[PDB]
């Protein structure tokens with residue numbers, strides 16, 4: 001299994017990255033350092049995770065230790081929803097760059113297609129429990145992302161949580177300057193995303209699978225929710241290959257030509273999660289894992305279902 005995939009900007013993206021959502025500032029510095037030591041070169045970040053300073057410290061530390069070169073790293077961050085206004089995008093990107101102590105990002109994503117009212121608060125809600133949106137739109141936000149490229153702040157731009165119609169909006173944009181390189185979407189055996197993956201891949205857009213382990217630490221988890229890591233059917237697949245359930249869950253997207261970004265702050269797990277280039281899932285295993293699809297989302301953005309750009313009304 002080649003370790004990197006070719007992007008439409010000529011750059012190569014490692015197919016296995018480290019997630020950092022919910023990684024406490026108290027622990028992510030260690031997490032990243034260990035990740036880099038055991039082979040990870042792609043780190044998935046976001047301003048909204050409010051830990052990019054601590055990620056940056058780890059990277060800086062390992063550059064000065066001479067463990068890795070900036071050029072070998074693929075650092076990804078995302079524009080949060082309260083910064084969709086054209087006038088706010090550069091400042092949002094430069095803040096991320098400053099926190100990460102970098103002078104470029106390899107990839108910068110619009111985190112969600114939905115713009116939220118600008119302000120200090122990351123998720124402003126109204127008295128009905130719905131998000132307070134902003135007067136922004138995807139195309140205008142995209143043009144703002146293009147300038148980041150044209151100014152050298154990021155090497156590639158993409159999108160996250162966009163449905164195929166929203167992607168299409170950008171693709172068909174008059175005066176398009178840069179095609180999206182990546183669409184980062186939730187993907188695992190309970191949400192297999194066949195049609196959206198088909199769509200993106202046919203459009204030369206690389207797909208990154210988030211929550212590949214089913215995000216057991218998601219803050220809104222309910223006891224009765226489906227649990228991938230516990231799923232006895234998947235454990236059985238793992239046992240057969242003498243690997244852990246998580247390793248099977250990370251290898252699965254890899255064999256669908258996806259990028260995958262499992263999150264851990266546990267040093268032992270960070271290392272284990274990377275040990276997935278030494279076995280292959282059988283044709284039967286893949287077919288089987290794909291058959292567990294339930295269209296079940298970790299991240300359904302339920303507070304925004306009335307937003308004009310809410311992505312998950314569409315079938316895909």
Ligand SMILES: NC(=O)c1ccc[n+]([C@@H]2O[C@H](COP(=O)([O-])OP(=O)(O)OC[C@H]3O[C@@H](n4cnc5c(N)ncnc54)[C@H](OP(=O)(O)O)[C@@H]3O)[C@@H](O)[C@H]2O)c1
Pocket residue numbers: 018019020021022044045111160161184185209210211212213214215216217229244246247261262263264265266269270272273298299
């Ligand atoms: N673009 C978006 O809107 C979006 C949305 C969600 C996620 N993402 C990105 O995708 C990453 C991955 O998704 P995620 O954080 O939702 O969840 P995930 O990676 O599916 O699951 C992380 C959970 O799994 C546990 N874990 C990791 N390795 C394990 C192993 N080998 N055995 C047992 N448990 C293990 C972690 O625990 P410990 O950390 O305590 O070890 C943590 O609780 C995020 O961190 C983020 O970078 C992007």
Ligand SMILES: O=C(O)CN1C(=O)C[C@@H](c2ccccc2)Sc2ccccc21
Pocket residue numbers: 123124125219220299300301302303304
């Ligand atoms: O419902 C979801 O899909 C996730 N969800 C959010 O969308 C609601 C969000 C929120 C909570 C409080 C103030 C502002 C915003 S984040 C959240 C937290 C707990 C539970 C759920 C959420």
Ligand SMILES: O=C(O)CN1C(=O)C[C@@H](c2ccccc2)Sc2ccccc21
Pocket residue numbers: 021046048049111122123299301
């Ligand atoms: O967007 C992600 O990558 C995950 N995620 C967050 O990082 C946003 C998080 C948040 C919500 C409210 C105040 C502060 C932070 S949780 C969340 C909820 C819905 C959707 C997404 C999130």
